[PDB]
Backbone atoms as SQL, in Angstrom:
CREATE TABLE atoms (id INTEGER PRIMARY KEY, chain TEXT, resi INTEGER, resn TEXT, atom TEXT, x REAL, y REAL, z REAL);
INSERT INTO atoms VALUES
  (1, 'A', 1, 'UNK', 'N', 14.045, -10.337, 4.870),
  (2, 'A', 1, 'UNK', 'CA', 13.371, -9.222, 5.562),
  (3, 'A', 1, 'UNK', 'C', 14.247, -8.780, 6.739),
  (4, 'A', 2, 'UNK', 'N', 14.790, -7.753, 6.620),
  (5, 'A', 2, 'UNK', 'CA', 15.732, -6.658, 7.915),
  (6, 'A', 2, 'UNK', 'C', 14.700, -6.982, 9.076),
  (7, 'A', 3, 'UNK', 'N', 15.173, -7.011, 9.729),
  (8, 'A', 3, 'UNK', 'CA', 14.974, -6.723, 11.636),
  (9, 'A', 3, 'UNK', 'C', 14.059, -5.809, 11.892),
  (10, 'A', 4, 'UNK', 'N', 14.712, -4.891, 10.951),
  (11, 'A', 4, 'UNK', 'CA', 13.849, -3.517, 10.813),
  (12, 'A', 4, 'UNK', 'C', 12.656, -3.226, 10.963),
  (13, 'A', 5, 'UNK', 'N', 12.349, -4.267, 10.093),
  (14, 'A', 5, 'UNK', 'CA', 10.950, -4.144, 9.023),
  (15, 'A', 5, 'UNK', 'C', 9.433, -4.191, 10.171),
  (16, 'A', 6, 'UNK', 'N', 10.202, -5.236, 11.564),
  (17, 'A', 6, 'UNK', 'CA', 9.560, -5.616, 12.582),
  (18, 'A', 6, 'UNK', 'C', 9.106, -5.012, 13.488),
  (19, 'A', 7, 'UNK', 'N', 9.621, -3.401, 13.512),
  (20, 'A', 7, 'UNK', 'CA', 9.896, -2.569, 14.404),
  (21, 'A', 7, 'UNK', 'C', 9.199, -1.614, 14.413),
  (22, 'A', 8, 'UNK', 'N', 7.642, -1.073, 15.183),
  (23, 'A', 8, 'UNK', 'CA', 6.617, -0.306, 15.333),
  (24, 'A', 8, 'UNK', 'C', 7.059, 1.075, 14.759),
  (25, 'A', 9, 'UNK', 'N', 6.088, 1.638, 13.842),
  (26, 'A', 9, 'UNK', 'CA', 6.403, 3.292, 13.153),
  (27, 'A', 9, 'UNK', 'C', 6.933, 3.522, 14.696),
  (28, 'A', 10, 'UNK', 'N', 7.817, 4.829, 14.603),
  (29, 'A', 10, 'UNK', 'CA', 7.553, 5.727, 14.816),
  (30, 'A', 10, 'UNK', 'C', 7.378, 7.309, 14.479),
  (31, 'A', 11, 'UNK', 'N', 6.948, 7.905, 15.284),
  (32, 'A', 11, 'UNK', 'CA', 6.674, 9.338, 14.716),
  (33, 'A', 11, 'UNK', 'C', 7.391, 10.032, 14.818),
  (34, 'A', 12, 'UNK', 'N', 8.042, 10.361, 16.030),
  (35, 'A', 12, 'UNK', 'CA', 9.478, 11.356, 16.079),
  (36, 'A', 12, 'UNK', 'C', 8.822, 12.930, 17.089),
  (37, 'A', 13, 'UNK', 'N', 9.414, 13.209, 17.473),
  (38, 'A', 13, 'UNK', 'CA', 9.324, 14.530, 17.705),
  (39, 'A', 13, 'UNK', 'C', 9.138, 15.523, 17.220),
  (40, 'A', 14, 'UNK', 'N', 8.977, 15.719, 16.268),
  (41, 'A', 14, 'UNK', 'CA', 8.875, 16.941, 15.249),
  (42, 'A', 14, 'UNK', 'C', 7.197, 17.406, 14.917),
  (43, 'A', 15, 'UNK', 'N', 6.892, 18.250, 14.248),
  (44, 'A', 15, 'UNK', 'CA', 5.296, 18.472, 14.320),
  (45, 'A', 15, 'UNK', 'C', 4.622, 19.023, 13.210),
  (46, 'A', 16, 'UNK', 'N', 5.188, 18.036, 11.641),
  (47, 'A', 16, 'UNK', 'CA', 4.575, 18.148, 10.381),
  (48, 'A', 16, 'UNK', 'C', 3.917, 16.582, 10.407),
  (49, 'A', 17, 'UNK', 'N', 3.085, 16.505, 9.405),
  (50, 'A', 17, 'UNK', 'CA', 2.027, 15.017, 9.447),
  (51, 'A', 17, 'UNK', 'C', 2.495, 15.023, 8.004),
  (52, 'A', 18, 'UNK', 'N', 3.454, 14.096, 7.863),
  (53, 'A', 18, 'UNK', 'CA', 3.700, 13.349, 7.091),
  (54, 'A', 18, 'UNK', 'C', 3.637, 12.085, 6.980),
  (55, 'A', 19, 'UNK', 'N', 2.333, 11.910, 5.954),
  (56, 'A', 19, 'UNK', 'CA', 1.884, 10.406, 5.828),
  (57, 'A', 19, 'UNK', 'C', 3.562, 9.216, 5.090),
  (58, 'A', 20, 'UNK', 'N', 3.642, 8.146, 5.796),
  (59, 'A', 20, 'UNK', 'CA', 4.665, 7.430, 5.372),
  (60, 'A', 20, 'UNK', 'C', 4.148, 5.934, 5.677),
  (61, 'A', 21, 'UNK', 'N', 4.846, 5.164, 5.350),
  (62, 'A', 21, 'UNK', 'CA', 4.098, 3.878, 5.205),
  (63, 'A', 21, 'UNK', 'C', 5.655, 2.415, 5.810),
  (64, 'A', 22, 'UNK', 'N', 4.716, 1.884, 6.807),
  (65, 'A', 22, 'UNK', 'CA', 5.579, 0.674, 7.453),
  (66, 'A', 22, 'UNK', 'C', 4.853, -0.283, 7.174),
  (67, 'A', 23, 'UNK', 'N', 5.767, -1.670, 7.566),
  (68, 'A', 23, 'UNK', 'CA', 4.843, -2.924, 7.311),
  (69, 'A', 23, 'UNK', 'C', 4.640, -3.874, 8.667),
  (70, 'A', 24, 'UNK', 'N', 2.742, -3.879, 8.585),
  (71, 'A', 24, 'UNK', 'CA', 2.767, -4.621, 9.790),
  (72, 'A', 24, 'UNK', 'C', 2.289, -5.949, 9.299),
  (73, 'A', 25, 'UNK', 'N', 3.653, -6.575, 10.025),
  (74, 'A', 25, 'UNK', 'CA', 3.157, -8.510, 9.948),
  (75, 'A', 25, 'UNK', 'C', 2.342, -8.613, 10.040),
  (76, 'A', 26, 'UNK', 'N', 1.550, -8.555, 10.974),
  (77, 'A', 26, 'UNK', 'CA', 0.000, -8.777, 11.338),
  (78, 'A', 26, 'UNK', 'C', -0.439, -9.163, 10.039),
  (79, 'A', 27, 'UNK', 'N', -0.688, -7.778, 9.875),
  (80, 'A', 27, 'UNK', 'CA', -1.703, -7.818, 8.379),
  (81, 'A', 27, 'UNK', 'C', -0.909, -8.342, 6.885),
  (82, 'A', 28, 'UNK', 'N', 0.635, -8.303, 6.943),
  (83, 'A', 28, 'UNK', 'CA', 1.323, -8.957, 5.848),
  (84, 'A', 28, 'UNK', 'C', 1.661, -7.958, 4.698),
  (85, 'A', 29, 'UNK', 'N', 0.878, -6.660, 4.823),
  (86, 'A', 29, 'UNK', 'CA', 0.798, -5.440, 4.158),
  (87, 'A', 29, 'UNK', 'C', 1.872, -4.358, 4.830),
  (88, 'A', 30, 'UNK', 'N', 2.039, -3.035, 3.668),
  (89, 'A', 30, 'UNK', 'CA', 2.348, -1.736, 4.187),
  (90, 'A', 30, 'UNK', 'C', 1.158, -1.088, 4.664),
  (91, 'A', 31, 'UNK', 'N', 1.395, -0.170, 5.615),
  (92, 'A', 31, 'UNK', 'CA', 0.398, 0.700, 5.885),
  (93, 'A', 31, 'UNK', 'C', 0.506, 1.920, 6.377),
  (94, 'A', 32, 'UNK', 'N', -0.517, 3.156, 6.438),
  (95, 'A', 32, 'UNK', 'CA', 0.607, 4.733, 6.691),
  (96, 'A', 32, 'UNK', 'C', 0.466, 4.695, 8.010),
  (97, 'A', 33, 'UNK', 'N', 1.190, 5.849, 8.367),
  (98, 'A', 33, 'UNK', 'CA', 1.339, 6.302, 9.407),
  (99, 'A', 33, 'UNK', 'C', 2.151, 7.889, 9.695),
  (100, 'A', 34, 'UNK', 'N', 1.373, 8.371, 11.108),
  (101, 'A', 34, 'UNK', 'CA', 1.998, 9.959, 10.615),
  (102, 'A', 34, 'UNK', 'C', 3.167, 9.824, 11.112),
  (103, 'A', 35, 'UNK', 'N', 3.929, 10.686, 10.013),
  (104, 'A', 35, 'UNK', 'CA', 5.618, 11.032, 10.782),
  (105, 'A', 35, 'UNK', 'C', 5.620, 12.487, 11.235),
  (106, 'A', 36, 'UNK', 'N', 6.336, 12.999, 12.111),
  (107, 'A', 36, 'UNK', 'CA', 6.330, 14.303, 12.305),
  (108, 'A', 36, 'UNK', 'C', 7.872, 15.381, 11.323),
  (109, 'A', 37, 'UNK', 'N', 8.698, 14.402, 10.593),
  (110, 'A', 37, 'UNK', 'CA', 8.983, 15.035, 9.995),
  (111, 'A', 37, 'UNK', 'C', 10.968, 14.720, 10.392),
  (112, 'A', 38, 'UNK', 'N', 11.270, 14.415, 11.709),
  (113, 'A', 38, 'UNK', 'CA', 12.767, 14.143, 11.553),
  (114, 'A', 38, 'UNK', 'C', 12.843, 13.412, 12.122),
  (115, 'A', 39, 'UNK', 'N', 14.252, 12.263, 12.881),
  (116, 'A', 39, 'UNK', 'CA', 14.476, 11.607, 13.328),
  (117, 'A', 39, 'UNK', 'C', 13.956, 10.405, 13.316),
  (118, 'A', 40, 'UNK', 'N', 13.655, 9.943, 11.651),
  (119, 'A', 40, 'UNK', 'CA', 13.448, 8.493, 11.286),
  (120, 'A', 40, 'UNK', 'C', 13.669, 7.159, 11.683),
  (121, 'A', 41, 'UNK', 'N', 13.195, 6.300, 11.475),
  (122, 'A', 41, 'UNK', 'CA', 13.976, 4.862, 11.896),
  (123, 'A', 41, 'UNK', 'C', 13.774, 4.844, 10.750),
  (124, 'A', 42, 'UNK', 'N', 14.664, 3.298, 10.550),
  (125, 'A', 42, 'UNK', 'CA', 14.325, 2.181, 9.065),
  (126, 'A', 42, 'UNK', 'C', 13.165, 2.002, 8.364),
  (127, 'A', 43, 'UNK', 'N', 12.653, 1.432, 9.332),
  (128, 'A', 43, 'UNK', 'CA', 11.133, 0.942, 9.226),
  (129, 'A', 43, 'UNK', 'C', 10.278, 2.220, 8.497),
  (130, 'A', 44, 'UNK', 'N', 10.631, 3.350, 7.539),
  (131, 'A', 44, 'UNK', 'CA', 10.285, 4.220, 7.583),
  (132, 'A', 44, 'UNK', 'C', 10.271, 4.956, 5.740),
  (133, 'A', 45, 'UNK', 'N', 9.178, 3.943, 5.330),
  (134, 'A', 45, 'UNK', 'CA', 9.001, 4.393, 3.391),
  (135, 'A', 45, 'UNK', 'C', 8.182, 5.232, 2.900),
  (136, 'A', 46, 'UNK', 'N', 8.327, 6.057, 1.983),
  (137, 'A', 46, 'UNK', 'CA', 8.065, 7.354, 0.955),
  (138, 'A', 46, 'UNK', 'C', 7.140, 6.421, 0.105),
  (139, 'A', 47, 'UNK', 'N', 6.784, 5.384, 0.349),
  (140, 'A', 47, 'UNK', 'CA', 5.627, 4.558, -0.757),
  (141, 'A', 47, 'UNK', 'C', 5.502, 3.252, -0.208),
  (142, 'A', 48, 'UNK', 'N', 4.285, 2.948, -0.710),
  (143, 'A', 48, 'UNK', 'CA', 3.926, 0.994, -0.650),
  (144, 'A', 48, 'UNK', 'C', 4.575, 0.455, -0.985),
  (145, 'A', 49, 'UNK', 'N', 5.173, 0.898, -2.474),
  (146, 'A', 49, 'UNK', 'CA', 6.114, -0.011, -3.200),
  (147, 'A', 49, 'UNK', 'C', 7.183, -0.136, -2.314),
  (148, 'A', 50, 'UNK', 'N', 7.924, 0.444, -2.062),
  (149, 'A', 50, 'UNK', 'CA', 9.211, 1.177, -1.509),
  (150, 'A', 50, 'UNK', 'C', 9.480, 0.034, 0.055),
  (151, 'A', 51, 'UNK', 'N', 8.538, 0.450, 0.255),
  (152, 'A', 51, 'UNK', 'CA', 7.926, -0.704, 1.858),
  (153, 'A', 51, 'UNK', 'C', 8.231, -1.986, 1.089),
  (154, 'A', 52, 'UNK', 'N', 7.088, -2.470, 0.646),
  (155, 'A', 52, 'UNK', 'CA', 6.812, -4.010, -0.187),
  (156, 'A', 52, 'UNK', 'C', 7.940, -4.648, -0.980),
  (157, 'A', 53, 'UNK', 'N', 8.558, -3.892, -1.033),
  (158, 'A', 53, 'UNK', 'CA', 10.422, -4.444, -1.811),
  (159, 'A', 53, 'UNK', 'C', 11.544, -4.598, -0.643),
  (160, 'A', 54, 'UNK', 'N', 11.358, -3.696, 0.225),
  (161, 'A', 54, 'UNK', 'CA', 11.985, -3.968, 1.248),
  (162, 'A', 54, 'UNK', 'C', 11.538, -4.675, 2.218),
  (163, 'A', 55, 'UNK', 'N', 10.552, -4.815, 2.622),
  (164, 'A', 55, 'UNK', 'CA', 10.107, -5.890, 3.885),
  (165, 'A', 55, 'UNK', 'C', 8.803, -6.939, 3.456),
  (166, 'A', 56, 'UNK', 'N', 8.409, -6.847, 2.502),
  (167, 'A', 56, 'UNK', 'CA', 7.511, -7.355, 1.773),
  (168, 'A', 56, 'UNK', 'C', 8.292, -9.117, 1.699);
């Protein structure tokens, strides 16, 4: 599991709600969260699956 994976969504500056999905330890799961659309981090998947293969 990347460093990454550890590292709180964020949203970005931008101002579209694009649902995307990070994984919080806590819960051991992916889960969404809004993006605004640019300036991504890692921590930052187009699906559950996508999340769950990478930090899963």
């Amino acid at each position: 599991r990347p460093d990454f994976c550890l590292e709180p969504p964020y949203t970005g500056p931008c101002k579209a709600r694009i649902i995307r999905y990070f994984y919080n330890a806590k819960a051991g799961l992916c889960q969404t969260f809004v993006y605004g659309g640019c300036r991504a981090k890692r921590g930052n998947f187009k699906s559950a699956e996508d999340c769950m293969r990478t930090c899963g």
